[PDB]
Structure formats: structure tokens, C-alpha cells
Short mmCIF file of N, CA and C in Angstrom, two decimals:
data_model
loop_
_atom_site.label_atom_id
_atom_site.label_comp_id
_atom_site.label_asym_id
_atom_site.label_seq_id
_atom_site.Cartn_x
_atom_site.Cartn_y
_atom_site.Cartn_z
N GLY A 1 120.92 -76.53 163.12
CA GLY A 1 121.92 -76.20 162.13
C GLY A 1 121.35 -75.45 160.95
N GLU A 2 121.62 -75.95 159.75
CA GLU A 2 121.42 -75.14 158.55
C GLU A 2 119.97 -74.74 158.35
N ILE A 3 119.02 -75.66 158.58
CA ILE A 3 117.61 -75.31 158.38
C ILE A 3 117.21 -74.19 159.32
N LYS A 4 117.58 -74.32 160.60
CA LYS A 4 117.17 -73.28 161.55
C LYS A 4 117.87 -71.95 161.28
N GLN A 5 119.13 -71.96 160.83
CA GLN A 5 119.80 -70.69 160.52
C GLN A 5 119.21 -70.04 159.27
N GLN A 6 118.91 -70.84 158.24
CA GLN A 6 118.28 -70.29 157.05
C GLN A 6 116.92 -69.68 157.38
N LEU A 7 116.14 -70.35 158.23
CA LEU A 7 114.84 -69.80 158.62
C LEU A 7 115.02 -68.49 159.38
N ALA A 8 116.01 -68.44 160.27
CA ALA A 8 116.29 -67.20 160.99
C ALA A 8 116.72 -66.09 160.04
N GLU A 9 117.59 -66.41 159.08
CA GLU A 9 118.00 -65.39 158.12
C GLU A 9 116.81 -64.89 157.32
N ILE A 10 115.92 -65.81 156.92
CA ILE A 10 114.75 -65.41 156.14
C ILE A 10 113.86 -64.48 156.96
N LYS A 11 113.63 -64.83 158.22
CA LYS A 11 112.78 -63.99 159.05
C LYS A 11 113.38 -62.61 159.24
N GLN A 12 114.71 -62.53 159.36
CA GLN A 12 115.36 -61.22 159.45
C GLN A 12 115.20 -60.42 158.16
N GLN A 13 115.35 -61.08 157.01
CA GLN A 13 115.15 -60.40 155.74
C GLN A 13 113.72 -59.89 155.60
N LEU A 14 112.74 -60.69 156.00
CA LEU A 14 111.35 -60.24 155.92
C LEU A 14 111.12 -59.01 156.79
N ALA A 15 111.71 -59.00 157.99
CA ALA A 15 111.59 -57.83 158.86
C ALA A 15 112.17 -56.60 158.19
N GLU A 16 113.36 -56.75 157.59
CA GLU A 16 114.01 -55.61 156.94
C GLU A 16 113.19 -55.11 155.75
N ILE A 17 112.57 -56.03 155.00
CA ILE A 17 111.71 -55.64 153.88
C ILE A 17 110.49 -54.88 154.38
N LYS A 18 109.90 -55.34 155.48
CA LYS A 18 108.76 -54.63 156.04
C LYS A 18 109.14 -53.21 156.47
N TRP A 19 110.33 -53.03 157.04
CA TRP A 19 110.78 -51.68 157.38
C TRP A 19 110.93 -50.82 156.13
N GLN A 20 111.57 -51.37 155.10
CA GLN A 20 111.76 -50.63 153.86
C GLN A 20 110.43 -50.18 153.28
N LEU A 21 109.43 -51.06 153.28
CA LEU A 21 108.11 -50.70 152.75
C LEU A 21 107.45 -49.60 153.58
N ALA A 22 107.57 -49.68 154.91
CA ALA A 22 107.02 -48.62 155.75
C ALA A 22 107.72 -47.30 155.49
N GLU A 23 109.03 -47.34 155.28
CA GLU A 23 109.78 -46.11 154.96
C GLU A 23 109.33 -45.52 153.63
N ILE A 24 109.15 -46.37 152.62
CA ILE A 24 108.69 -45.90 151.31
C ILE A 24 107.31 -45.28 151.43
N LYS A 25 106.40 -45.95 152.13
CA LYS A 25 105.08 -45.37 152.39
C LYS A 25 105.18 -43.99 153.02
N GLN A 26 106.03 -43.85 154.04
CA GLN A 26 106.15 -42.55 154.70
C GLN A 26 106.74 -41.51 153.76
N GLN A 27 107.71 -41.91 152.93
CA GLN A 27 108.27 -40.99 151.93
C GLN A 27 107.20 -40.50 150.97
N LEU A 28 106.33 -41.41 150.50
CA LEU A 28 105.26 -40.99 149.60
C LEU A 28 104.25 -40.08 150.29
N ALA A 29 104.03 -40.27 151.59
CA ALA A 29 103.11 -39.41 152.34
C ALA A 29 103.72 -38.08 152.75
N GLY A 30 105.04 -37.94 152.63
CA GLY A 30 105.69 -36.67 152.92
C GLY A 30 105.75 -36.36 154.40
N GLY B 1 117.94 -82.33 152.99
CA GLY B 1 118.61 -81.64 151.90
C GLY B 1 117.75 -80.79 150.97
N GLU B 2 116.58 -81.32 150.57
CA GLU B 2 115.68 -80.55 149.71
C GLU B 2 115.21 -79.25 150.38
N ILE B 3 114.77 -79.34 151.64
CA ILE B 3 114.35 -78.13 152.36
C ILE B 3 115.47 -77.10 152.34
N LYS B 4 116.69 -77.54 152.66
CA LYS B 4 117.83 -76.62 152.67
C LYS B 4 118.00 -75.93 151.32
N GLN B 5 117.80 -76.66 150.22
CA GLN B 5 117.98 -76.03 148.92
C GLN B 5 116.88 -75.01 148.64
N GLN B 6 115.64 -75.33 149.01
CA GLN B 6 114.54 -74.38 148.83
C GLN B 6 114.68 -73.16 149.73
N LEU B 7 115.10 -73.35 150.98
CA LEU B 7 115.28 -72.19 151.85
C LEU B 7 116.40 -71.28 151.33
N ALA B 8 117.47 -71.88 150.80
CA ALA B 8 118.53 -71.08 150.20
C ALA B 8 118.02 -70.25 149.02
N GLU B 9 117.16 -70.84 148.19
CA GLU B 9 116.58 -70.08 147.08
C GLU B 9 115.69 -68.96 147.58
N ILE B 10 114.94 -69.21 148.66
CA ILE B 10 114.07 -68.18 149.23
C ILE B 10 114.89 -67.01 149.77
N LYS B 11 115.96 -67.32 150.49
CA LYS B 11 116.86 -66.28 150.98
C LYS B 11 117.42 -65.45 149.83
N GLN B 12 117.82 -66.10 148.74
CA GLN B 12 118.38 -65.37 147.60
C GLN B 12 117.35 -64.43 146.98
N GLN B 13 116.11 -64.90 146.82
CA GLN B 13 115.06 -64.03 146.27
C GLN B 13 114.78 -62.85 147.20
N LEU B 14 114.76 -63.09 148.51
CA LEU B 14 114.53 -62.01 149.45
C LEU B 14 115.66 -60.98 149.42
N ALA B 15 116.90 -61.44 149.28
CA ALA B 15 118.01 -60.51 149.14
C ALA B 15 117.83 -59.62 147.91
N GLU B 16 117.37 -60.22 146.80
CA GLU B 16 117.13 -59.45 145.58
C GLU B 16 115.99 -58.45 145.77
N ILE B 17 114.94 -58.86 146.49
CA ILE B 17 113.84 -57.95 146.80
C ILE B 17 114.33 -56.77 147.63
N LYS B 18 115.17 -57.03 148.63
CA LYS B 18 115.74 -55.97 149.46
C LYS B 18 116.49 -54.95 148.62
N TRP B 19 117.32 -55.43 147.70
CA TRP B 19 118.06 -54.52 146.83
C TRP B 19 117.12 -53.68 145.97
N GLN B 20 116.07 -54.30 145.43
CA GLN B 20 115.14 -53.55 144.60
C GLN B 20 114.43 -52.49 145.41
N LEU B 21 114.08 -52.80 146.65
CA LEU B 21 113.41 -51.81 147.50
C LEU B 21 114.36 -50.69 147.91
N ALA B 22 115.63 -51.02 148.19
CA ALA B 22 116.62 -49.97 148.45
C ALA B 22 116.74 -49.03 147.27
N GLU B 23 116.69 -49.57 146.05
CA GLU B 23 116.76 -48.70 144.87
C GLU B 23 115.54 -47.80 144.76
N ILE B 24 114.35 -48.35 145.00
CA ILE B 24 113.14 -47.55 144.91
C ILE B 24 113.15 -46.45 145.96
N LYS B 25 113.56 -46.80 147.19
CA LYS B 25 113.70 -45.80 148.24
C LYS B 25 114.61 -44.67 147.80
N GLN B 26 115.74 -45.01 147.18
CA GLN B 26 116.69 -43.98 146.78
C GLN B 26 116.14 -43.13 145.65
N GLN B 27 115.36 -43.73 144.74
CA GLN B 27 114.76 -42.94 143.67
C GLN B 27 113.81 -41.89 144.23
N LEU B 28 113.01 -42.27 145.22
CA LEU B 28 112.02 -41.35 145.75
C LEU B 28 112.64 -40.30 146.66
N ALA B 29 113.66 -40.68 147.43
CA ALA B 29 114.22 -39.79 148.44
C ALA B 29 115.53 -39.13 148.02
N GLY B 30 116.19 -39.63 146.98
CA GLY B 30 117.51 -39.14 146.62
C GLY B 30 117.45 -37.84 145.84
N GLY C 1 103.51 -83.22 151.00
CA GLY C 1 102.37 -82.61 151.65
C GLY C 1 102.64 -81.18 152.06
N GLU C 2 102.40 -80.88 153.34
CA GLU C 2 102.29 -79.48 153.76
C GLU C 2 103.59 -78.71 153.54
N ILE C 3 104.74 -79.31 153.85
CA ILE C 3 106.00 -78.58 153.68
C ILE C 3 106.20 -78.23 152.21
N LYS C 4 105.98 -79.20 151.32
CA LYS C 4 106.21 -78.91 149.90
C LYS C 4 105.19 -77.92 149.35
N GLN C 5 103.94 -77.95 149.82
CA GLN C 5 102.95 -76.98 149.34
C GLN C 5 103.25 -75.58 149.86
N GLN C 6 103.65 -75.47 151.13
CA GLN C 6 104.03 -74.17 151.67
C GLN C 6 105.22 -73.59 150.92
N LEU C 7 106.21 -74.42 150.60
CA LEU C 7 107.36 -73.94 149.84
C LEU C 7 106.94 -73.47 148.46
N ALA C 8 106.05 -74.22 147.82
CA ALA C 8 105.53 -73.81 146.51
C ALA C 8 104.78 -72.49 146.60
N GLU C 9 103.92 -72.35 147.62
CA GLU C 9 103.20 -71.09 147.78
C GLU C 9 104.17 -69.94 148.00
N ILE C 10 105.21 -70.16 148.80
CA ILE C 10 106.18 -69.09 149.07
C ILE C 10 106.88 -68.69 147.78
N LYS C 11 107.30 -69.68 146.99
CA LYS C 11 107.99 -69.35 145.74
C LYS C 11 107.09 -68.58 144.80
N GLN C 12 105.80 -68.92 144.76
CA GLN C 12 104.85 -68.15 143.94
C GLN C 12 104.71 -66.72 144.45
N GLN C 13 104.63 -66.54 145.77
CA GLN C 13 104.55 -65.19 146.32
C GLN C 13 105.79 -64.38 145.99
N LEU C 14 106.97 -64.99 146.09
CA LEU C 14 108.19 -64.27 145.76
C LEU C 14 108.19 -63.83 144.30
N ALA C 15 107.72 -64.70 143.40
CA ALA C 15 107.63 -64.34 141.99
C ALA C 15 106.71 -63.14 141.81
N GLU C 16 105.55 -63.17 142.46
CA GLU C 16 104.59 -62.08 142.33
C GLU C 16 105.16 -60.77 142.88
N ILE C 17 105.91 -60.85 143.98
CA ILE C 17 106.55 -59.66 144.54
C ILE C 17 107.59 -59.10 143.58
N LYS C 18 108.37 -59.98 142.95
CA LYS C 18 109.35 -59.51 141.97
C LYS C 18 108.68 -58.81 140.80
N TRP C 19 107.52 -59.32 140.34
CA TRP C 19 106.80 -58.62 139.28
C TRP C 19 106.33 -57.25 139.74
N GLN C 20 105.76 -57.18 140.94
CA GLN C 20 105.29 -55.90 141.47
C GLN C 20 106.42 -54.88 141.53
N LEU C 21 107.60 -55.30 141.98
CA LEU C 21 108.74 -54.39 142.07
C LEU C 21 109.18 -53.92 140.68
N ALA C 22 109.20 -54.82 139.70
CA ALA C 22 109.55 -54.42 138.34
C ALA C 22 108.53 -53.43 137.79
N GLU C 23 107.25 -53.65 138.09
CA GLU C 23 106.21 -52.72 137.65
C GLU C 23 106.38 -51.35 138.28
N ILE C 24 106.68 -51.32 139.58
CA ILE C 24 106.89 -50.05 140.28
C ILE C 24 108.09 -49.32 139.68
N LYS C 25 109.19 -50.04 139.47
CA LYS C 25 110.35 -49.44 138.80
C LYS C 25 109.97 -48.82 137.46
N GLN C 26 109.20 -49.55 136.65
CA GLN C 26 108.83 -49.01 135.34
C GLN C 26 107.92 -47.80 135.49
N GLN C 27 107.01 -47.82 136.47
CA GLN C 27 106.17 -46.65 136.73
C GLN C 27 107.00 -45.43 137.09
N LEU C 28 108.02 -45.61 137.94
CA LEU C 28 108.88 -44.48 138.29
C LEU C 28 109.69 -43.98 137.11
N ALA C 29 110.05 -44.87 136.18
CA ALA C 29 110.80 -44.47 135.00
C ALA C 29 109.92 -43.88 133.91
N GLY C 30 108.61 -44.02 134.01
CA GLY C 30 107.70 -43.40 133.07
C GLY C 30 107.69 -44.09 131.72
N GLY D 1 106.92 -80.59 162.24
CA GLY D 1 106.01 -79.56 162.73
C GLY D 1 106.56 -78.15 162.86
N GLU D 2 107.79 -78.01 163.39
CA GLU D 2 108.39 -76.68 163.52
C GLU D 2 108.59 -76.01 162.16
N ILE D 3 109.15 -76.75 161.19
CA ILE D 3 109.32 -76.18 159.84
C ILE D 3 107.99 -75.67 159.31
N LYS D 4 106.94 -76.49 159.44
CA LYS D 4 105.62 -76.09 158.97
C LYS D 4 105.17 -74.78 159.61
N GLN D 5 105.45 -74.60 160.90
CA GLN D 5 105.01 -73.37 161.54
C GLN D 5 105.80 -72.17 161.03
N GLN D 6 107.11 -72.33 160.84
CA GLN D 6 107.93 -71.24 160.30
C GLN D 6 107.57 -70.92 158.86
N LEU D 7 107.32 -71.94 158.04
CA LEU D 7 106.94 -71.65 156.65
C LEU D 7 105.60 -70.92 156.59
N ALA D 8 104.66 -71.30 157.47
CA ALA D 8 103.39 -70.59 157.53
C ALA D 8 103.58 -69.12 157.90
N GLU D 9 104.49 -68.83 158.84
CA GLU D 9 104.76 -67.44 159.19
C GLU D 9 105.40 -66.69 158.03
N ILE D 10 106.27 -67.37 157.27
CA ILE D 10 106.92 -66.74 156.12
C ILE D 10 105.88 -66.40 155.05
N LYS D 11 104.98 -67.33 154.77
CA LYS D 11 103.91 -67.07 153.82
C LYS D 11 103.07 -65.88 154.25
N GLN D 12 102.75 -65.79 155.54
CA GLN D 12 101.93 -64.67 156.03
C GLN D 12 102.64 -63.34 155.85
N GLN D 13 103.94 -63.29 156.15
CA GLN D 13 104.70 -62.05 155.96
C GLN D 13 104.77 -61.67 154.48
N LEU D 14 104.95 -62.66 153.60
CA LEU D 14 104.99 -62.37 152.17
C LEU D 14 103.65 -61.85 151.66
N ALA D 15 102.55 -62.41 152.17
CA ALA D 15 101.24 -61.89 151.79
C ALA D 15 101.10 -60.43 152.19
N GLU D 16 101.58 -60.08 153.39
CA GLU D 16 101.53 -58.69 153.84
C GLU D 16 102.40 -57.79 152.98
N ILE D 17 103.58 -58.28 152.59
CA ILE D 17 104.45 -57.53 151.69
C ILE D 17 103.76 -57.27 150.35
N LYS D 18 103.10 -58.30 149.80
CA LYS D 18 102.36 -58.15 148.54
C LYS D 18 101.32 -57.05 148.63
N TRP D 19 100.55 -57.04 149.72
CA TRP D 19 99.54 -56.00 149.91
C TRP D 19 100.17 -54.62 149.98
N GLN D 20 101.29 -54.49 150.69
CA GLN D 20 101.94 -53.19 150.81
C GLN D 20 102.44 -52.72 149.45
N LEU D 21 102.96 -53.64 148.64
CA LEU D 21 103.44 -53.26 147.32
C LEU D 21 102.29 -52.91 146.38
N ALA D 22 101.16 -53.63 146.47
CA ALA D 22 99.97 -53.25 145.71
C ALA D 22 99.52 -51.84 146.06
N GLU D 23 99.60 -51.48 147.34
CA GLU D 23 99.22 -50.12 147.73
C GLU D 23 100.17 -49.08 147.16
N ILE D 24 101.48 -49.35 147.21
CA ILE D 24 102.45 -48.40 146.69
C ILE D 24 102.26 -48.24 145.18
N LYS D 25 102.05 -49.35 144.48
CA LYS D 25 101.76 -49.29 143.05
C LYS D 25 100.57 -48.39 142.77
N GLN D 26 99.51 -48.53 143.56
CA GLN D 26 98.31 -47.75 143.32
C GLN D 26 98.54 -46.28 143.63
N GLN D 27 99.36 -45.98 144.65
CA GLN D 27 99.66 -44.58 144.95
C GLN D 27 100.37 -43.92 143.78
N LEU D 28 101.32 -44.62 143.17
CA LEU D 28 102.10 -44.01 142.10
C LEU D 28 101.32 -43.94 140.80
N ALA D 29 100.50 -44.95 140.51
CA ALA D 29 99.82 -45.04 139.22
C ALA D 29 98.36 -44.60 139.26
N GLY D 30 97.75 -44.50 140.43
CA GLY D 30 96.33 -44.23 140.53
C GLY D 30 96.01 -42.76 140.33
#
């Protein structure tokens, strides 16, 4: 239930943050 | 119950981080 | 024990990430 | 035990995010 869904949501957010950071890095590298 | 409250706070902070990174991405690429 | 220490470490990391993002924002604003 | 393993993974991802943000900060300010 709630603990496992919150953990899943957190892991999804961390994945999305990692993508955003990789995109920013690529933008800075041109 | 305590774990649930801490995980909820973690999710909220990650959501705020995502928004801040979306803004930085838009500043660099917009 | 371990659950509470891991949660504390995570909350500290989130705080540090929020500072880094605020610093980056200020750097972009000059 | 499961919570402990997920929290450990969350801490590891946050550490990686911190490093990526330190690099971006250095690119902009260095």
C-alpha cells in the first residue's frame, strides 16, 4: 500500500531528475 | 505512520527539485 | 536505527540539493 | 529490510544528483 507506492513514486521522480540533469549537461555542451 | 510521513515529505521535496530543474533547463534552452 | 538514519541522511541530501539549485539559479541571474 | 534497501537506493541516487549539480555549478561559475 502507501509505503510501497510512495517509494515507487520517489524512484520515478529520481529517474526524471536524472534525465533532466543529463539534458542540462548536454545543453551546456552544445 | 512515521515512515509514510517522511516519504511524503521526500516526494514533496523531489517535486520541488523537478520544478527548479525544469526552470533551469528553460533558462538555458529557451 | 537504520531506517531513521537513512531518512535523516536523505533529508540532508535534499536540503543540500535545494541549496545547489538556488546557487545555480543565482549564477544564471548574475 | 525492504524499506532499508529502497532507502539505501534513494540515498545513492541523491548522492549522484548532488555530484551532477556540483559539476553544472562548476561549468557555469568556473
